[PDB]
Design a protein around this ligand. Structure first.
Ligand SMILES: Nc1ncnc2c1ncn2[C@@H]1O[C@H](COP(=O)(O)OP(=O)(O)O)[C@@H](O)[C@H]1O
Ligand SMILES: [Mg+2]
Length: 257
């Protein structure tokens, strides 16, 4: 066996893991969380929490190994604007607090070493943000990612928030529209596999009232029912459609309890 580098061995180990949501209920229906090497899709109407969950995932991928995490970094591709930097602060801060609790309680002198470096700021530093304003910019950026990711093997998650927004307009040539959309999917599948990371795509079209999606291994639909929030597992390897409750808090995505 070999030659492999120790870096190759670390990436194969990560390959196996999932990125927690901070909702025990979301984690259960996802199989432990958002899986690496796969594309996961979050659908729902405006205000359901696509971006909140995206941001929660971008923070969570950075949780250290000694707290059960992936300990990777994130790319966040924003195609819509109206990004609130202060939300990522709130979320990051609560994830730091949560690990500080485990390190102090149930005591390990290497969790105290990680706490040295796991701050709200180090979490914001580990998220690489790009703004795209149209589909052509988005296509050009994705073409550029193999390079970015060679320079940044820390990257374990790529968010595109949202995939649908730059395709919401009429194309004259419809055959071109699907070509381009089937190509992005294949580009995303390729990255997830060759760079051993999760691709997380946000989408408006599929709501709890509603071709593409074939490439997504998991599709979650986030919606409202009465006065609470729910996530439906709409597509998964098990093929069983379970809805679980969740809430959004200043800390981020949490269980209802
Ligand atoms: N600090 C906060 N505490 C609790 N809920 C929040 C907070 N900030 C935003 N929200 C909730 O998050 C929602 C916005 O979710 P967002 O992820 O932007 O939706 P979208 O699916 O359109 O991306 C708002 O409806 C509000 O209900
Ligand atoms: Mg949003």
């Amino acid at each position: 066996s070999g030659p492999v580098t120790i870096l190759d061995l670390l990436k194969d180990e990560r390959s196996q893991l999932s990125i927690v949501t901070f909702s025990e209920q979301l984690d259960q229906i996802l199989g432990g969380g958002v899986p690496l090497t796969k594309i996961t899709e979050i659908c729902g109407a405006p205000g359901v929490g696509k971006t909140q969950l995206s941001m929660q995932l971008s923070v969570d991928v950075q949780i250290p190994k000694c707290f059960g995490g992936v300990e990777g970094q994130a790319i966040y591709i924003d195609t819509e604007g109206s990004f609130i930097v202060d939300r990522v602060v709130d979320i990051a801060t609560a994830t730091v607090q949560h690990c500080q609790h485990i390190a102090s309680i149930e005591n390990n002198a290497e969790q105290a070493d990680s706490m040295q470096s796991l701050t709200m700021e180090s979490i914001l530093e580990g998220i690489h943000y790009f703004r795209c304003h149209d589909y052509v910019q988005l296509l050009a950026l994705v073409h550029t990612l193999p390079d970015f990711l060679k320079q940044h093997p820390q990257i374990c998650l790529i968010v595109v928030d949202s995939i649908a927004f730059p395709f919401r307009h009429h194309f004259e040539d419809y055959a071109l529209r699907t070509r381009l959309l089937n190509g992005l999917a294949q580009s995303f599948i390729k990255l997830a596999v060759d760079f051993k990371l999760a691709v997380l795509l946000t989408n408006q079209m599929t709501t709890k009232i509603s071709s593409w999606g074939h490439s997504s291994t998991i599709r979650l639909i986030l919606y409202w029912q009465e006065k609470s929030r729910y996530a439906l597992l709409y597509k998964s390897p098990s093929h069983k459609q379970i809805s679980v409750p969740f809430q959004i808090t200043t800390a981020g995505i949490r269980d209802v309890c």
